[PDB]
A paper describes a structure:
Hydroxynitrile lyase from Hevea brasiliensis (HbHNL) and the esterase SABP2 from Nicotiana tabacum share the α/β-hydrolase fold, a Ser–His–Asp catalytic triad and 44% sequence identity, yet catalyze different reactions. To investigate how regions beyond the active site influence catalytic efficiency and active-site geometry, we engineered HbHNL variants with increasing numbers of substitutions to match SABP2. Variant HNL16 has all amino acids within 6.5 Å of the active site identical to SABP2, HNL40 those within 10 Å and HNL71 those within 14 Å. HNL16 exhibited poor esterase activity, whereas both HNL40 and HNL71 showed efficient esterase catalysis, demonstrating that residues beyond the immediate active site are critical for functional conversion.
Variant HNL40 introduces 40 changes to HbHNL to increase its sequence identity with SABP2 to 59%. Thus, HNL40 contains a total of 40 amino-acid changes relative to HbHNL: 38 amino-acid substitutions and two inserted amino acids. The kcat value for HNL40 (74 min−1) is 300-fold higher than that for HbHNL and only approximately twofold lower than SABP2. Thus, the 40 changes introduced to create HNL40 appear to have restored the oxyanion-hole and catalytic atom positions to be more similar to those in SABP2, but not identical. The l-proline originated from the crystallization solution, which contained 0.2 Ml-proline, and mimics a bound carboxylate product of an esterase reaction. In the HNL40 structure containing the bound proline, the hydrogen-bond pattern with the catalytic serine differs because the catalytic serine Oγ adopts a different conformation. The new tunnel to the right appears near the insertion site (after residue Pro126) of two amino acids in HNL40. The secondary structure of the main chain in this region changes from a loop to a helix for the two inserted residues (Ala127-Glu128) and the two subsequent residues Asn129-Trp130.
Author numbering: 1 to 258
Write the structure that this text describes.
Amino acid sequence: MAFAHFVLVHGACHGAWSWHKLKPLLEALGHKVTALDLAASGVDPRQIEEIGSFDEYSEPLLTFLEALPPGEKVILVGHSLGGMNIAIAADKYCEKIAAAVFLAAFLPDTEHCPSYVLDKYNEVTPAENWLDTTFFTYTKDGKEITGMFFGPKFLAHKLYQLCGPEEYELAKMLVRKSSLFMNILAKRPFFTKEGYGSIKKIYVWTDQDKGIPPEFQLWQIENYKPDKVYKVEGGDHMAMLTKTKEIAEILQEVADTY
Ligand code: PRO
Protein backbone atom coordinates (compact mmCIF):
# COMPACT_ATOMS: atom_id res chain seq x y z
CA MET A 1 0.00 0.00 0.00
CA ALA A 2 1.24 3.52 -0.82
CA PHE A 3 0.92 6.35 1.72
CA ALA A 4 -0.98 9.37 0.41
CA HIS A 5 -2.13 12.73 1.78
CA PHE A 6 -5.87 13.06 1.05
CA VAL A 7 -7.48 16.50 1.13
CA LEU A 8 -11.27 16.05 1.42
CA VAL A 9 -13.49 18.90 0.20
CA HIS A 10 -17.22 19.03 1.06
CA GLY A 11 -20.12 20.30 -1.04
CA ALA A 12 -22.74 23.00 -0.70
CA CYS A 13 -24.17 23.82 2.76
CA HIS A 14 -21.95 21.16 4.37
CA GLY A 15 -18.57 21.11 6.05
CA ALA A 16 -15.57 19.04 7.02
CA TRP A 17 -17.93 17.19 9.41
CA SER A 18 -19.38 15.41 6.34
CA TRP A 19 -16.10 13.43 6.25
CA HIS A 20 -16.27 12.29 9.90
CA LYS A 21 -16.76 8.59 9.03
CA LEU A 22 -14.27 8.38 6.14
CA LYS A 23 -11.38 10.37 7.61
CA PRO A 24 -10.66 8.01 10.56
CA LEU A 25 -10.78 4.98 8.25
CA LEU A 26 -8.26 6.52 5.84
CA GLU A 27 -5.96 7.40 8.75
CA ALA A 28 -6.21 3.88 10.20
CA LEU A 29 -4.98 2.57 6.85
CA GLY A 30 -2.00 4.86 7.37
CA HIS A 31 -2.74 7.92 5.24
CA LYS A 32 -2.56 11.61 6.06
CA VAL A 33 -5.99 13.21 5.83
CA THR A 34 -6.99 16.87 5.83
CA ALA A 35 -10.68 17.79 5.95
CA LEU A 36 -11.27 21.52 5.37
CA ASP A 37 -14.17 23.84 6.02
CA LEU A 38 -14.58 26.03 2.96
CA ALA A 39 -15.38 29.69 3.54
CA ALA A 40 -18.60 30.22 5.49
CA SER A 41 -18.99 26.44 5.92
CA GLY A 42 -18.84 24.11 8.89
CA VAL A 43 -17.51 26.16 11.78
CA ASP A 44 -15.70 28.72 9.61
CA PRO A 45 -16.43 32.12 11.25
CA ARG A 46 -17.49 33.95 8.05
CA GLN A 47 -21.07 34.20 6.76
CA ILE A 48 -21.90 33.64 3.09
CA GLU A 49 -22.64 37.35 2.55
CA GLU A 50 -18.92 38.10 3.07
CA ILE A 51 -18.02 35.75 0.19
CA GLY A 52 -17.90 37.45 -3.20
CA SER A 53 -16.84 34.68 -5.59
CA PHE A 54 -16.15 31.00 -5.95
CA ASP A 55 -12.43 31.75 -5.54
CA GLU A 56 -13.04 33.34 -2.12
CA TYR A 57 -15.32 30.43 -1.18
CA SER A 58 -12.32 28.20 -1.99
CA GLU A 59 -9.85 30.29 0.06
CA PRO A 60 -9.21 27.68 2.84
CA LEU A 61 -8.27 25.09 0.22
CA LEU A 62 -6.00 27.44 -1.70
CA THR A 63 -4.46 28.69 1.56
CA PHE A 64 -3.84 25.12 2.73
CA LEU A 65 -2.25 24.19 -0.60
CA GLU A 66 -0.03 27.31 -0.59
CA ALA A 67 1.36 26.13 2.76
CA LEU A 68 2.18 22.62 1.52
CA PRO A 69 5.96 22.21 1.84
CA PRO A 70 7.82 21.77 -1.47
CA GLY A 71 7.77 18.30 -3.00
CA GLU A 72 4.60 17.32 -1.13
CA LYS A 73 1.75 16.21 -3.37
CA VAL A 74 -1.84 15.50 -2.30
CA ILE A 75 -4.81 13.58 -3.63
CA LEU A 76 -7.81 15.95 -3.70
CA VAL A 77 -11.23 14.45 -2.97
CA GLY A 78 -14.24 16.62 -3.73
CA HIS A 79 -17.88 15.79 -3.18
CA SER A 80 -20.72 17.39 -5.13
CA LEU A 81 -20.07 21.16 -5.38
CA GLY A 82 -16.60 20.31 -4.04
CA GLY A 83 -15.65 19.27 -7.56
CA MET A 84 -15.72 22.95 -8.52
CA ASN A 85 -13.38 23.90 -5.66
CA ILE A 86 -10.83 21.29 -6.64
CA ALA A 87 -10.83 22.68 -10.19
CA ILE A 88 -10.04 26.15 -8.86
CA ALA A 89 -7.33 24.60 -6.68
CA ALA A 90 -5.73 22.54 -9.46
CA ASP A 91 -5.48 25.63 -11.66
CA LYS A 92 -3.28 27.46 -9.16
CA TYR A 93 -1.36 24.54 -7.60
CA CYS A 94 -1.30 21.71 -10.14
CA GLU A 95 2.35 20.91 -9.30
CA LYS A 96 1.11 19.91 -5.83
CA ILE A 97 -1.69 17.56 -6.98
CA ALA A 98 -1.02 13.86 -7.47
CA ALA A 99 -4.65 13.27 -8.48
CA ALA A 100 -8.17 14.63 -8.09
CA VAL A 101 -11.06 12.36 -7.10
CA PHE A 102 -14.59 13.53 -8.01
CA LEU A 103 -17.09 11.85 -5.65
CA ALA A 104 -20.49 12.28 -7.34
CA ALA A 105 -19.23 15.78 -7.98
CA PHE A 106 -19.40 18.54 -10.52
CA LEU A 107 -16.64 17.99 -13.10
CA PRO A 108 -15.94 21.21 -15.04
CA ASP A 109 -13.84 21.18 -18.20
CA THR A 110 -11.47 23.54 -20.00
CA GLU A 111 -13.37 24.04 -23.27
CA HIS A 112 -16.51 25.78 -21.94
CA CYS A 113 -17.08 28.41 -19.30
CA PRO A 114 -16.52 27.23 -15.70
CA SER A 115 -20.27 27.30 -14.94
CA TYR A 116 -21.00 24.96 -17.88
CA VAL A 117 -21.82 21.79 -15.93
CA LEU A 118 -23.79 23.83 -13.39
CA ASP A 119 -25.80 25.36 -16.24
CA LYS A 120 -26.53 21.93 -17.71
CA TYR A 121 -27.45 20.67 -14.23
CA ASN A 122 -30.07 23.41 -13.74
CA GLU A 123 -31.63 22.84 -17.19
CA VAL A 124 -32.26 19.16 -16.41
CA THR A 125 -33.20 19.53 -12.76
CA PRO A 126 -36.94 20.17 -12.25
CA ALA A 127 -37.44 23.12 -9.93
CA GLU A 128 -39.81 21.02 -7.82
CA ASN A 129 -36.81 18.84 -6.80
CA TRP A 130 -35.49 21.51 -4.45
CA LEU A 131 -38.52 21.06 -2.13
CA ASP A 132 -38.15 23.37 0.89
CA THR A 133 -34.70 24.73 0.00
CA THR A 134 -34.61 28.48 0.58
CA PHE A 135 -33.05 30.80 -2.00
CA PHE A 136 -31.85 34.30 -1.22
CA THR A 137 -29.89 37.20 -2.68
CA TYR A 138 -27.16 39.43 -1.33
CA THR A 139 -24.69 41.92 -2.77
CA LYS A 140 -20.92 41.63 -2.37
CA ASP A 141 -18.07 43.62 -3.92
CA GLY A 142 -20.73 45.19 -6.14
CA LYS A 143 -22.15 41.90 -7.45
CA GLU A 144 -25.58 40.42 -6.72
CA ILE A 145 -25.26 36.74 -5.73
CA THR A 146 -27.96 34.11 -5.25
CA GLY A 147 -27.52 31.69 -2.36
CA MET A 148 -29.35 28.64 -1.14
CA PHE A 149 -30.00 26.88 2.16
CA PHE A 150 -31.12 23.25 2.09
CA GLY A 151 -34.28 22.64 4.08
CA PRO A 152 -35.19 19.61 6.17
CA LYS A 153 -37.35 17.88 3.55
CA PHE A 154 -34.86 18.44 0.74
CA LEU A 155 -32.15 16.99 2.99
CA ALA A 156 -34.39 14.10 4.08
CA HIS A 157 -35.69 13.19 0.60
CA LYS A 158 -32.89 14.16 -1.82
CA LEU A 159 -29.58 13.90 0.07
CA TYR A 160 -29.92 11.65 3.16
CA GLN A 161 -32.60 9.25 2.00
CA LEU A 162 -30.45 6.17 2.69
CA CYS A 163 -28.95 7.50 5.96
CA GLY A 164 -30.07 6.72 9.48
CA PRO A 165 -31.72 9.39 11.62
CA GLU A 166 -28.51 9.95 13.61
CA GLU A 167 -26.61 11.24 10.55
CA TYR A 168 -29.64 13.16 9.26
CA GLU A 169 -29.97 14.90 12.63
CA LEU A 170 -26.38 16.12 12.25
CA ALA A 171 -27.38 17.73 8.93
CA LYS A 172 -30.35 19.57 10.41
CA MET A 173 -28.11 20.79 13.23
CA LEU A 174 -25.14 21.87 11.09
CA VAL A 175 -26.08 22.84 7.50
CA ARG A 176 -25.49 26.51 6.73
CA LYS A 177 -26.26 28.93 3.90
CA SER A 178 -24.13 28.53 0.78
CA SER A 179 -24.08 29.58 -2.90
CA LEU A 180 -23.18 28.27 -6.33
CA PHE A 181 -21.90 31.72 -7.39
CA MET A 182 -23.36 30.92 -10.80
CA ASN A 183 -23.37 34.39 -12.30
CA ILE A 184 -19.94 35.06 -10.78
CA LEU A 185 -18.82 31.82 -12.44
CA ALA A 186 -20.29 32.98 -15.76
CA LYS A 187 -17.85 35.93 -15.96
CA ARG A 188 -14.84 33.92 -14.67
CA PRO A 189 -11.78 32.97 -16.78
CA PHE A 190 -12.03 29.41 -18.07
CA PHE A 191 -10.12 26.61 -16.36
CA THR A 192 -6.77 26.23 -18.11
CA LYS A 193 -5.57 23.12 -19.95
CA GLU A 194 -2.06 23.80 -18.62
CA GLY A 195 -3.19 23.75 -14.99
CA TYR A 196 -6.44 21.92 -14.21
CA GLY A 197 -6.41 19.97 -17.48
CA SER A 198 -2.99 18.50 -16.69
CA ILE A 199 -3.82 16.73 -13.40
CA LYS A 200 -5.07 13.14 -13.29
CA LYS A 201 -8.79 12.77 -12.62
CA ILE A 202 -10.86 9.96 -11.08
CA TYR A 203 -14.69 9.94 -11.07
CA VAL A 204 -16.69 7.84 -8.61
CA TRP A 205 -20.36 7.85 -9.50
CA THR A 206 -23.27 6.80 -7.31
CA ASP A 207 -26.37 4.95 -8.46
CA GLN A 208 -28.94 6.40 -5.99
CA ASP A 209 -27.91 10.06 -5.75
CA LYS A 210 -31.20 12.01 -5.80
CA GLY A 211 -29.36 15.33 -5.60
CA ILE A 212 -27.12 14.78 -8.60
CA PRO A 213 -28.77 11.87 -10.43
CA PRO A 214 -26.60 9.17 -12.03
CA GLU A 215 -27.59 10.19 -15.57
CA PHE A 216 -26.11 13.62 -14.99
CA GLN A 217 -22.96 12.14 -13.43
CA LEU A 218 -22.56 9.89 -16.49
CA TRP A 219 -23.15 12.85 -18.83
CA GLN A 220 -20.34 14.70 -17.06
CA ILE A 221 -18.02 11.74 -17.63
CA GLU A 222 -18.86 11.69 -21.36
CA ASN A 223 -18.38 15.46 -21.57
CA TYR A 224 -14.91 15.28 -20.03
CA LYS A 225 -13.47 11.78 -20.00
CA PRO A 226 -11.46 11.15 -16.80
CA ASP A 227 -8.46 8.86 -16.49
CA LYS A 228 -10.41 6.33 -14.38
CA VAL A 229 -14.04 5.75 -13.34
CA TYR A 230 -15.50 3.73 -10.44
CA LYS A 231 -19.05 2.83 -9.49
CA VAL A 232 -20.48 2.76 -5.96
CA GLU A 233 -23.83 0.93 -5.94
CA GLY A 234 -26.20 1.77 -3.09
CA GLY A 235 -24.74 5.22 -2.37
CA ASP A 236 -27.05 8.15 -1.89
CA HIS A 237 -25.80 11.72 -2.14
CA MET A 238 -24.03 11.25 1.19
CA ALA A 239 -22.04 8.25 0.05
CA MET A 240 -19.10 9.00 2.35
CA LEU A 241 -21.62 8.19 5.13
CA THR A 242 -23.57 5.26 3.62
CA LYS A 243 -20.75 3.60 1.64
CA THR A 244 -17.73 4.73 3.67
CA LYS A 245 -15.85 1.43 3.41
CA GLU A 246 -16.37 1.13 -0.37
CA ILE A 247 -14.99 4.63 -0.89
CA ALA A 248 -11.99 3.94 1.31
CA GLU A 249 -11.19 0.87 -0.80
CA ILE A 250 -11.40 3.02 -3.94
CA LEU A 251 -9.17 5.73 -2.48
CA GLN A 252 -6.59 3.08 -1.54
CA GLU A 253 -6.46 1.95 -5.18
CA VAL A 254 -6.11 5.58 -6.33
CA ALA A 255 -3.26 6.16 -3.89
CA ASP A 256 -1.70 2.89 -5.15
CA THR A 257 -2.02 4.13 -8.79
CA TYR A 258 -1.11 7.84 -8.55
O1 PRO B 1 -23.01 20.26 -3.21
C1 PRO B 1 -24.02 19.65 -2.85
O2 PRO B 1 -23.94 18.80 -1.94
C2 PRO B 1 -25.32 20.02 -3.56
C3 PRO B 1 -26.41 18.97 -3.35
C4 PRO B 1 -27.38 19.21 -4.55
C5 PRO B 1 -26.54 19.87 -5.66
N1 PRO B 1 -25.22 20.06 -5.02
